[PDB]
């Protein structure tokens, strides 16, 4: 034997779980049965005639990349079932041979070097198919003759002989070149595969373009927030290749590989909520039925488990603790239910190890400035905010996918609570895409896929504990502008809207919320203390509303409260909406089955052609009806200002004052004065100290932000970049934001 055979067997185990794959393990056996069934189902439908014109009738068309890719996937599934201990197909020679004959038929009639490397869809021809074929070759290696291996591997080398792309594509090329290298035993190619990981969009942090950013963000395709879509792919592929090579002659030696640990801590951990990977960072993949938030999260944990296998201390350990917690948290979808048998094996080992304790749940406010995203994690809930600007696109839609993604990133708020299923169970193909929670739009009117014309999108973070975001709205498809802010405190989030103006001639509205209800659509809900009808199909206007309470889809942990300072008039409707995934993902393989989900939708009508309109509401997660009423009677927050010049909210109980200044002119919000566009938050501890965080969300200020605070200080300390010019009678300092890329600068002043 040689180190190649050693590596080959290493990858094979990664695919099957290995010989020690305890078939007695409940979950393993369950997974191995689902596997064997799918294989049997395909095998029984195969056209085994030597004169066949296709492998499967439902996937015919030797030139349709979508179909060919699917054909290879099936053959891959069949191979696994034929090589996974415990499978009812393990070692079945007939299956093995039928699979190899299929590959030969495909080589002759579809996948070979006479085809164009760039024919639609190039992705299938260069990455998708090779990844499946390599896996098959590795699994049925022993039963593959030289003559056959040649046709398989020679074809892959033709389509993808090297690594030259970036981000996910580059990683996919690396794993393609790598596994083939192990198969044909090409040390040169194998080394190139290893080096591939050091390229753009992978190990090294990006300061622009595709890749992981130092602030935790992930971008793909230049302007799209993609941590949970393409980022998940880079993570999975990077983890699989690193683990494979680890300890071998071609182990990854690039020091930047430690960046990988940060992706988990900073890029993923904050965007996970009890097993779900937030959709706001999944791009057009939200329109994929097989990749709903929990299915995706399970994939990310699988990757964390893969890294735990070779990562150094104290990372391997932390990875296990994070994985454990997530697996225990997700009571919607069994983590073991949709991951590899090897993942299950390595995961059960972590979960069943009493010495490993579940990591603490994240608790913070984080500003993903590089990708116009922000997140708040608290006990019982998490709020995700998706924005867009001149740097980040509204939404992505290519290959007929995500056709209604319009407002999924235009000031859209995503609330995560104990209703783990909220965004899964066909939320995307049924929800009214024109009414994404938190957004302000021209009623029933879409917008284009692309960046905006405003750079003021981002926010400030106060020690990662609290924060505030803002977005300068101005759509290109039609006329509509506004200043939208969000202030994230401890148990509430305050959304402010000002200067909402339009000449479009289309009724303008701001969505307070749009939640998928229980199967019966009978969730109880109240307004000002009076129960509201729970019937489906009923529309109703609520006038002079101070507060609304909506009972969650779980006995507790998912209720949502809404407080309206100064009262409001809400337009609402509870209805059963029908749709199909094909409607938002028009690809041949997409299921067209109809689904029906219930929704409670609430929004503010700003009328047609409003001028300087505004709004203000507070999201009170998990509070009961009584608690919302109690809050409403003596609210913890207070709106300091809500003009097109400055939006400011104070949180009385915490001594917090947040303010978003929208212009480059001196303005004042409570104790805070700023001379330029800025996002600011202060925390005042009576007669002791005043904390302050400042950021330039535009990421375009090449000088400073001059801030003044209406308090007299004795002393201070501040992050580099900040220069204090005065402490008494008032606090004055400037913030050097040239090249800050939307980061927050902190300062703490000793009052006295
Ligand atoms: C298996 C699957 C799928 O989910 O259907 O096949 C299609 C493949 O598309 C990938 O995105 C490609 C896109 O298809 C292609 O037209 C261009 O390049 C994109 C890329 O950056 O990889 C990615 O979206 C990738 O996730 C996706 O995987
Ligand atoms: Ca509070």
Angle (CA) 46 52 53, round 5°: 105
Asked whether the beta carbons of 496 and 649 are under 8 A apart, the reply is yes
Contacts with 1 (C-beta within 8 Å, 6 or more apart), sequence order: none
Give φ, ψ of 218 to 5 degrees: -140, 125
654-659 contact pairs (CB < 8 A, 24+): 654/466, 654/489, 654/490, 654/683, 655/683, 655/684, 655/685, 655/686, 656/462, 656/466, 656/489, 656/681, 656/682, 656/683, 656/684, 657/681, 657/682, 657/684, 658/460, 658/466, 658/467, 658/468, 658/487, 659/468
* Whole-Å CA distances, 708 to 660, 696, 713, 737: 14, 16, 12, 16
Write out residues with Cβ below 6 Å of ligand 1.
121, 123, 128, 168-169, 233, 399
Residues 364, 329: contact at Cβ < 8 Å? Answer: no
Q: How far apart are CA 152 and CA 108, in angstroms?
A: 11
Query: Cα 382–387–390 angle (5° rounding)?
Result: 155
Give the tokens for residue 154. Answer: 């020679």
What separation in angstroms does the CA of 467 have from each of 321, 692, 705?
A: 27, 11, 18
Cα 379 to Cα 401: distance, rounded to the nearest angstrom: 35
Q: How far apart are the CA of 313 and the centre of ligand 2, in A?
A: 39
Closest CA to ligand 1's atom 13: 123
What is the strand order of the sheet 211-212 is part of? Answer: 211-212, 218-220, 224-225
Residues 6+ apart with CB under 8 A from 550: 513, 515, 523, 525, 559, 560, 561, 562, 600
Cα separation of 376 and 490, whole Å?
A: 9
Q: Which residue has the tokens 């999924």?
A: 408
Cis peptide bond prior to 388, omega within 30° of 0: no
3-state helix, strand, coil in the chain (%, to 5): 30, 30, 40
Structure tokens at 555: 């006995």
CA-based nearest residue to 110, from 125, 131, 99, 123: 125
The DSSP bridge partners found for residue 494 are 487, 618
Cα R_g (the chain), whole angstroms: 27
What's the rounded Cα separation, in Å, for the pair 177 and 179?
6
Encoded tokens for 450: 């692309």
Resolution rounded to one decimal, in angstroms: 2.1
User: Alpha carbon 653 to chain centroid distance?
Assistant: 33
Q: How far is the CA of 466 from the centre of ligand 2 (A)?
A: 11
**By alpha-carbon position, which residue is closest to atom 26 of ligand 1?**
230
Q: How many CB atoms lie within 10 A of CB 114?
A: 6
Give the three-state DSSP class for 342: helix
Using the 8-state DSSP alphabet, how is residue 8 labeled?
H
Query: Of all helices (H) and strands (E), which one includes residue 327?
Result: helix 315-329
Biggest distance spanned by C-alpha atoms of the chain = 92
Centre of ligand 1 from the C-alpha of residue 469, in Å? 32
Q: Is 694 helix (H, G, I), strand (E, B) or coil?
A: strand
- Phi and psi at residue 591, in whole multiples of 5°? -65, 140
For the sheet containing 412-416, what is the strand order? 364-368, 373-378, 381-386, 412-416
Contact 520, 537 (CB under 8 A): no
HEC sequence for 575-609: EEEEECHHHCECCCCCCCCCEEEEEEEEEEEEEEC
Region of 274 on the Ramachandran plot (φ > 0 left; ψ -120 to 50 alpha; else beta) = left
Write the CA distances from 535 to 202, 256, 502, 723, integer angstroms. 51, 57, 35, 60
Span from the CA of 399 to the centroid of ligand 1 (angstroms): 9
| Superfamily (CATH) of domain 1-361 | Chondroitin AC/alginate lyase (1.50.10.100)
Under a CB-based contact definition with an 8 Å cutoff, are residues 489 and 462 in contact?
no
- Whole-angstrom distance, CA of residue 689 vs CA of residue 672: 15
Task: Please give, one letter per residue, the 3-state secondary structure of 96-152.
Answer: HHHHHHHHHHHHHHCCCCCCCCCCCCHHHHHHHHHHHHHHHHHHCHHHCCHHHHHHH
Task: Give residues with Cβ within 8 angstroms of 273, minimum separation 6.
Answer: 377, 382, 416
Say how many CA atoms lie within 13 Å of 360 toward its Cβ: 6
The residues pairing with 486 across neighbouring beta strands, listed in sequence order, are 469, 495
Q: Can you name the residues that pair with 708 across neighbouring β-strands?
A: 673, 732
* CA 705 to chain centroid: 32
Question: Do residues 513 and 451 make contact, with C-beta atoms less than 8 angstroms apart?
Answer: no
Q: Does residue 294 sit in helix, strand or coil?
A: helix
Integer CA distances (angstroms), 658 to 172, 502, 744, in order: 44, 27, 13
CATH class held by domain 362-634: mainly beta
Asked whether 642 and 632 are in contact (CB, 8 A), the reply is: no
CA distance 72 to 78: 10
Crossing angle (nearest 10°) for helices 230-245 and 167-184: 30
Ligand 1 closest atom vs CA 233: 26
Q: Which atom of ligand 1 is nearest to the CA of 398?
A: 16
Token digits of residue 389: 């600007």
Q: Determine the Cα–Cα distance for residues 55 and 100; give it in Å rounded to an integer.
A: 12
Q: Is 68 exposed, middle or buried (0-12, 13-18, 19+ CB in 10 A)?
A: buried
Hey, whose CA ends up nearest to atom 10 of ligand 1? 123
Check if the beta carbon of residue 139 is closer than 8 Å to that of residue 11.
no
β partners of residue 446: none
In the reported structure, the alpha carbon of residue 491 is separated from the centroid of ligand 2 by a whole-number distance in angstroms of: 5
> Cα(206)–Cα(439) distance, rounded to whole angstroms?
30
Q: At what angle do helices 167-184 and 129-139 cross, to 10 degrees?
A: 30
| Shortest-distance ligand to the CA of residue 589 | 1
**Which atom of ligand 1 lies closest to the CA of 169?**
22
Q: What's phi and psi for 211, nearest 5 deg? A: 130, 175
Distance, C-alpha 385 to centroid of its chain = 11
Q: How was this structure determined?
A: X-ray
Active site residues: 230
CB contact at 8 A, 526 and 546: no
Phi and psi, residue 117, nearest 5°: -75, -25
User: Helix or strand or coil: residue 678?
Assistant: strand
Nearest-CA neighbor of 528 among 490, 567, 556? 567
| Among candidate residues 171, 172, 177, the one with its CA nearest the CA of residue 158 | 177
Is 311 buried (19+), middle (13-18) or exposed (0-12) by CB count in 10 A? buried
Which residues 6+ apart lie within 8 Å of 742 measured at CB? 215, 367, 369, 370, 458, 695, 696, 697, 699
Backbone angles phi, psi at 423, to 5 degrees: -95, 0
Q: Rounded distance, CA 523 to CA 516, Å?
A: 10
Which class is domain 635-752? Answer: mainly beta
Residues written for the chain: 752
Name the residue among 532, 514, 542, 539 with its Cα closest to residue 598: 514
Give, as one character, the DSSP assignment of residue 519.
T
Q: If residue 561 lies in a helix (H) or strand (E), which one and from where to where?
A: strand 560-579
Give the atom of ligand 1 at the shortest distance from the alpha carbon of 220: 21
Tell which phi-psi region holds residue 91, choosing left (phi > 0), alpha (psi between -120 and 50) or beta: left
For residue 553, the tally of other CB atoms under 10 A from its CB is 21
DSSP 45-97: T----TT-S-S-GGG--TT-HHHHHHHHHHHHHHHHHHHSTT-TTTT-HHHHH
Could you write out the DSSP letters of every residue in 170-193? HHHHHHHHHHHHHHHT-HHHHHHH
Closest to 438 in 3D by CA, of 416, 415, 411, 417: 411
Joined tokens for residue 509:
């509205």
Do the Cβ atoms of 427 and 597 come closer than 8 Å? yes
Which residues on neighbouring strands pair with residue 560, listed in sequence order? 550, 621
CB 395 within 8 Å of CB 287: no
Grouping H, G, I as helix, E, B as strand and the rest as coil, residue 317 is helix
- Half-sphere exposure of residue 92: CA atoms within 13 angstroms, side-chain side: 19
- Among 68, 74, 123, residue to substitute to test ligand 1 (most atoms within 8 Å of Cβ): 123
Instruction: Note whether 241 and 179 are within 8 A (CB).
Output: no
**Domain locations in the chain?**
1-361, 362-634, 635-752
Report the distance separating Cα 434 and Cα 441, nearest Å: 8
Nearest to 660 by CA among 683, 688, 639, 632: 639
């Amino acid at each position: 034997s040689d180190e190649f055979d050693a590596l080959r067997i290493k990858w094979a185990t990664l695919l099957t779980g290995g010989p020690a794959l305890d078939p007695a393990d409940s979950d393993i056996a369950a997974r191995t049965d689902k596997l064997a069934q799918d294989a049997n189902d395909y095998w029984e439908d195969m056209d085994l005639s030597s004169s066949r014109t296709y492998i499967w009738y439902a996937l015919r068309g030797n030139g349709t990349s979508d179909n060919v890719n699917a054909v290879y996937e099936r053959l891959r599934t069949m191979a696994l079932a034929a090589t996974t201990v415990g499978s009812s197909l393990y070692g079945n020679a007939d299956l093995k041979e039928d699979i190899l004959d299929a590959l030969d038929w495909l080589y002759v009639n579809s996948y070979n070097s006479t085809r164009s490397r760039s024919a639609y869809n190039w992705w299938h021809w260069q990455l998708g198919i090779p990844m499946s074929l390599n896996d098959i070759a590795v699994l049925l290696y022993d039963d593959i003759s030289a003559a056959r291996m040649a046709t398989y591997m020679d074809t892959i080398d033709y389509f993808t002989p090297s690594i030259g792309l970036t981000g996910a594509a580059r990683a996919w090329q690396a794993i393609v070149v790598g596994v083939r290298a192990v198969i044909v035993k090409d040390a040169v190619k194998l080394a190139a595969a290893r080096n591939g990981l050091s390229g753009t969009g992978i190990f090294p942090y990006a300061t622009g373009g595709d890749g992981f950013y130092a602030d935790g963000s992930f971008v793909q395709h230049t302007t799209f927030a993609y941590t949970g879509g393409y980022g998940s792919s880079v993570l999975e592929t990077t983890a699989n290749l690193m683990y494979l090579l680890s300890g071998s002659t071609w182990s990854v030696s690039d020091p930047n590989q430690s960046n990988v640990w940060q992706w988990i801590y900073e890029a993923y951990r904050p965007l996970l909520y009890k097993g779900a990977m937030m959709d706001m960072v999944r791009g057009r993949e939200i329109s994929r039925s097989y990749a709903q938030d929990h299915a995706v999260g399970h994939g990310i944990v699988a990757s964390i488990v893969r890294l735990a296998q070779f990562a150094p201390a104290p990372h391997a350990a932390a990875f296990k603790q994070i994985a454990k917690r997530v697996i225990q948290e997700d009571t919607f979808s069994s983590f073991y239910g949709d991951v590899s048998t090897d993942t299950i094996r390595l995961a059960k080992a972590i979960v069943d190890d009493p010495s490993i304790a579940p990591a603490a749940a994240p608790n913070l406010y984080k500003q993903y400035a590089a990708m116009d995203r922000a997140v708040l994690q608290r006990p019982g809930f998490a709020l995700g905010l998706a924005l867009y600007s001149t740097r980040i696109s509204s939404y992505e839609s290519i290959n007929s996918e995500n056709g209604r993604g319009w407002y999924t990133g235009a000031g859209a708020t995503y609330l995560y609570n104990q209703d783990l299923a909220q965004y899964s169970e066909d939320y995307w193909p049924t929800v009214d895409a024109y009414r994404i929670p938190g957004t302000t739009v021209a009623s029933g009117t879409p917008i284009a896929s692309g960046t905006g014309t405003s750079s003021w999108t981002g926010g400030v973070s106060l020690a990662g504990q609290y924060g505030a975001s803002g977005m300068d709205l101005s759509y290109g498809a039609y006329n509509l502008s506004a200043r939208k802010s969000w202030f994230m405190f401890d148990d509430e989030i305050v959304a402010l809207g000002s200067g909402i103006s339009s000449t479009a001639g289309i009724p303008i509205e701001t969505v307070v919320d749009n939640r998928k209800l229980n199967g019966a659509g009978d969730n109880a809900w109240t307004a000002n203390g009076a129960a509201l009808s729970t019937g489906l199909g009923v529309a109703q206007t609520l006038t002079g509303v101070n507060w609304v309470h909506l009972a969650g889809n779980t006995a507790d942990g998912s209720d949502i409260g809404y407080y309206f300072p100064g009262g409001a008039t809400l337009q609402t409707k509870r209805e059963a909406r029908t749709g199909t995934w094909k409607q938002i993902n028009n690809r041949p393989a997409t299921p067209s089955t109809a689904v029906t989900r219930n929704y409670e939708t609430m929004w503010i009508d700003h009328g047609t052609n409003p001028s300087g309109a505004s709004y203000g509401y507070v999201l009170l997660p998990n509070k009961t009806s009584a608690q919302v009423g109690a809050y409403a009677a003596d609210p913890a927050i207070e709106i300091v200002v809500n003009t097109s010049g400055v939006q400011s909210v104070k949180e009385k109980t915490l001594g917090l004052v947040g303010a978003n200044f929208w212009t480059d002119t001196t303005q004042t919000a409570d104790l805070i004065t700023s001379n330029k566009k800025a996002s600011v938050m202060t925390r005042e501890i009576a007669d002791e100290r005043l904390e302050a965080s400042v950021s330039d969300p535009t990421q375009a200020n090449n000088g400073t932000i001059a801030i003044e605070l209406a308090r007299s200080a004795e002393g201070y300390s501040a992050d580099p970049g900040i220069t204090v010019t005065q402490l008494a009678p008032t606090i004055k300092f400037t913030v050097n934001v040239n090249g800050a890329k939307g980061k927050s600068f902190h300062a703490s002043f000793q009052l006295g």
